[PDB]
PDB file of C-alpha atoms in Angstrom:
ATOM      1  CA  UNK A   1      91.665 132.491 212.733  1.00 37.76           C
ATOM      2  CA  UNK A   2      93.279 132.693 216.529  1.00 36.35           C
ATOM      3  CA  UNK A   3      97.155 132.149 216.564  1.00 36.79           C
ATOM      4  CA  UNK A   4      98.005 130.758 213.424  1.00 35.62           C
ATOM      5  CA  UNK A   5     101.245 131.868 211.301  1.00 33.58           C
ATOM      6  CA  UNK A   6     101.932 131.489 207.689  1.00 29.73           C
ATOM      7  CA  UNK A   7     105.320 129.361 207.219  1.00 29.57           C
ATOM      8  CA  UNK A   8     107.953 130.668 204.327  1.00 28.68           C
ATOM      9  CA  UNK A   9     106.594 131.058 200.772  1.00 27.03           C
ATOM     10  CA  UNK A  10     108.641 128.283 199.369  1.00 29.63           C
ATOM     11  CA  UNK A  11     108.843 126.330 196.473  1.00 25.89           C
ATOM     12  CA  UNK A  12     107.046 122.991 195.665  1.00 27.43           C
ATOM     13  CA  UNK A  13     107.804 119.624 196.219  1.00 27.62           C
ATOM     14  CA  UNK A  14     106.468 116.930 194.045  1.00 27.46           C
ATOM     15  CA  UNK A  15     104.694 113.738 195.235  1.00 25.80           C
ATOM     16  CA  UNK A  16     104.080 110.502 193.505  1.00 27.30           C
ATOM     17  CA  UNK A  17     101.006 108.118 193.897  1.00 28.64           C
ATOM     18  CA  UNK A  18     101.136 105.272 190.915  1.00 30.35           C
ATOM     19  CA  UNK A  19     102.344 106.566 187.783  1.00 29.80           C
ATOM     20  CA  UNK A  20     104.360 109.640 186.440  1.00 29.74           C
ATOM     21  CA  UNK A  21     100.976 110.394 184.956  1.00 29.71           C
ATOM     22  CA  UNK A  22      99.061 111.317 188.496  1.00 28.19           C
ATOM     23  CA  UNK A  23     102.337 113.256 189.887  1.00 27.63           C
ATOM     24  CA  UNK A  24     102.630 115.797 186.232  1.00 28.42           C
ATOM     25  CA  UNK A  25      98.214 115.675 186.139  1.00 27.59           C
ATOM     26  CA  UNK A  26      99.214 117.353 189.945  1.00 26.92           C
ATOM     27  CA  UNK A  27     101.795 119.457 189.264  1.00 27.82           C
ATOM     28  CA  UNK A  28     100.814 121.262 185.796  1.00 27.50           C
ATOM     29  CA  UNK A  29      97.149 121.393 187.586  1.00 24.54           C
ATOM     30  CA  UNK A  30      98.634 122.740 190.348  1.00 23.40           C
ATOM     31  CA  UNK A  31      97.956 126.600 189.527  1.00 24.19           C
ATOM     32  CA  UNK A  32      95.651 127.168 192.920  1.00 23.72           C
ATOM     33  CA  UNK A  33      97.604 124.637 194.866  1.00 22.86           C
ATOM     34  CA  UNK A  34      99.476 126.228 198.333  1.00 20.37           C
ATOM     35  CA  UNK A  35     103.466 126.496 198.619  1.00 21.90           C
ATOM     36  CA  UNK A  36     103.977 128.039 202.268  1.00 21.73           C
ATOM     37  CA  UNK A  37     101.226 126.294 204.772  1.00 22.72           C
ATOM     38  CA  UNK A  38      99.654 127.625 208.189  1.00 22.50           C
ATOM     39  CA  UNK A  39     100.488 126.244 211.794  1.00 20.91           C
ATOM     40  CA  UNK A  40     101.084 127.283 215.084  1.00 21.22           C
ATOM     41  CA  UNK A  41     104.076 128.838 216.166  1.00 19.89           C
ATOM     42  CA  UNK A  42     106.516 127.228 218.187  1.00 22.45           C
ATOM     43  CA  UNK A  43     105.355 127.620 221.743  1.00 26.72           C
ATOM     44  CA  UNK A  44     104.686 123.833 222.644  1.00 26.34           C
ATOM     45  CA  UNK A  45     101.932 122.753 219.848  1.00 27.23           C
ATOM     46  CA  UNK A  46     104.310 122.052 217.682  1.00 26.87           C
ATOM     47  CA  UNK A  47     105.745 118.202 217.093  1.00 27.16           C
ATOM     48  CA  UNK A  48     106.550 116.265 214.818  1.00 28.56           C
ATOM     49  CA  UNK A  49     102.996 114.634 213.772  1.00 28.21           C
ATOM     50  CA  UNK A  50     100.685 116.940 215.763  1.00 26.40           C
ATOM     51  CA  UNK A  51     102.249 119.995 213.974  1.00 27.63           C
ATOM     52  CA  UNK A  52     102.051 117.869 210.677  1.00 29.33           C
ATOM     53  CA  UNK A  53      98.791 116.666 211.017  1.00 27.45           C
ATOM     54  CA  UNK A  54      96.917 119.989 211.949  1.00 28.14           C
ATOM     55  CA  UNK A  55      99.237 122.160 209.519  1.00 27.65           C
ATOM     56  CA  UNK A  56      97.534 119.811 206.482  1.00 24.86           C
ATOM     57  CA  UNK A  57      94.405 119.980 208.094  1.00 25.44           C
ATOM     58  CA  UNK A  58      94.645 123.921 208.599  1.00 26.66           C
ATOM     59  CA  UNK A  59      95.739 124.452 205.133  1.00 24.85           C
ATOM     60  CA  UNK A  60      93.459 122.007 203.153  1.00 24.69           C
ATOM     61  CA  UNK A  61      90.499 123.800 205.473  1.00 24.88           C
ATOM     62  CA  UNK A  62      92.028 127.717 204.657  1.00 27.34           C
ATOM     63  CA  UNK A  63      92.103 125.654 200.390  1.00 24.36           C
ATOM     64  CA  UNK A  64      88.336 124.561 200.950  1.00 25.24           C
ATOM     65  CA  UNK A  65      86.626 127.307 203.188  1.00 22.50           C
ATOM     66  CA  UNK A  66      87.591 130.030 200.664  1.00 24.72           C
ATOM     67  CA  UNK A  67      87.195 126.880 198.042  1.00 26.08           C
ATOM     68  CA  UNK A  68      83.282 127.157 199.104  1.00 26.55           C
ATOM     69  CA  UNK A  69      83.040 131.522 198.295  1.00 20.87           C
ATOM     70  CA  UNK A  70      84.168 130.967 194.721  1.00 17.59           C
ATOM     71  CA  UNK A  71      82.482 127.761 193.295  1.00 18.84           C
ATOM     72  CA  UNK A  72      85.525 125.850 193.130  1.00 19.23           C
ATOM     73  CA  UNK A  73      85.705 122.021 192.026  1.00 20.46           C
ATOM     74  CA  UNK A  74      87.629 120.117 194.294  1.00 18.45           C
ATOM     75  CA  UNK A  75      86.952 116.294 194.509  1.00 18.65           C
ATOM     76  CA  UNK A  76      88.275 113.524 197.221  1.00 19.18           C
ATOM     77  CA  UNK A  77      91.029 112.588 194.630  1.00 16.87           C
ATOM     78  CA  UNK A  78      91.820 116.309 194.159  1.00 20.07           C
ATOM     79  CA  UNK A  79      91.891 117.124 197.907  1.00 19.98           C
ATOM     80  CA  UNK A  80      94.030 113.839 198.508  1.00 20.20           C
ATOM     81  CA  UNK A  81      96.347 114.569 196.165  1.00 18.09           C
ATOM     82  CA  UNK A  82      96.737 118.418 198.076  1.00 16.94           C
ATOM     83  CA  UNK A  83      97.151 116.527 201.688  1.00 15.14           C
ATOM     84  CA  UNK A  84      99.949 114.351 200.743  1.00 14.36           C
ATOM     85  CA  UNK A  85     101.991 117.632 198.878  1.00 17.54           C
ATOM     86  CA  UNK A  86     100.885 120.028 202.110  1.00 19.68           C
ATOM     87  CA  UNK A  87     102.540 117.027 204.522  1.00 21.62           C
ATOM     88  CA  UNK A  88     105.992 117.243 202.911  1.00 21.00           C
ATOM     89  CA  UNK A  89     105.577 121.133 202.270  1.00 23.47           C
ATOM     90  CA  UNK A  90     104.811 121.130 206.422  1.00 23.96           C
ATOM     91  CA  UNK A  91     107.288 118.506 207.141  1.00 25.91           C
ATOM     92  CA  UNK A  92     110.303 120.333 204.979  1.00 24.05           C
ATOM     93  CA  UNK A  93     109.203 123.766 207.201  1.00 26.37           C
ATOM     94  CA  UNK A  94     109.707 122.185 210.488  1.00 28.40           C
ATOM     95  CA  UNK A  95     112.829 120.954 209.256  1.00 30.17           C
ATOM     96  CA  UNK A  96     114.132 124.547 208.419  1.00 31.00           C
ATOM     97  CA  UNK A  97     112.525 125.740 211.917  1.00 29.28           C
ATOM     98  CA  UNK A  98     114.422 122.252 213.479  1.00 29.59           C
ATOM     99  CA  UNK A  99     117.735 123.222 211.890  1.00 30.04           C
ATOM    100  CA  UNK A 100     117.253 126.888 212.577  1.00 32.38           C
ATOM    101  CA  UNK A 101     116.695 126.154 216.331  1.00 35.32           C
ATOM    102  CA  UNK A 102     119.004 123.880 216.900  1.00 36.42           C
ATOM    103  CA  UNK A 103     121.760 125.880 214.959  1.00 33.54           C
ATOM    104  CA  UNK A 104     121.120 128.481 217.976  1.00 29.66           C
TER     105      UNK A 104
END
């Protein structure tokens, strides 16, 4: 890797697409799907949407590159559906590391 971290192990937050149907076929699925994601640390990287952005892209990649060592079955829906929960799991992380630094 480099100088990536590993964010708190939290829990899940859900994410809805078109029907109550594609959120539960997620989230009962959801067995190998992440809860904490990798970034940078707070240093100057981080942002708003660059942090975002990369954090997804980082974690999708460290949920494909392994993915590729044990013949797993991931499709563009599947992935998809992973990017959209890893942006609010990143987005909810900075906001405990936003309301941890600013409580300072």
């Amino acid at each position: 890797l480099g100088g990536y971290m590993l964010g708190s192990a939290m829990s899940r937050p859900i994410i809805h697409f078109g029907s109550d149907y594609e959120d539960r076929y997620y989230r009962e699925n959801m067995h190998r799907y992440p809860n904490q994601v990798y970034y940078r640390p707070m240093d100057e990287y981080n942002n708003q949407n660059n942090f975002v952005h990369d954090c997804v892209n980082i974690t999708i990649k460290q949920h494909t590159v392994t993915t590729t060592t044990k013949g797993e079955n991931f499709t563009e829906t599947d992935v998809k559906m992973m990017e959209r929960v890893v942006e609010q799991m990143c987005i909810t992380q900075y906001e405990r590391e936003s309301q941890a630094y600013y409580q300072r």
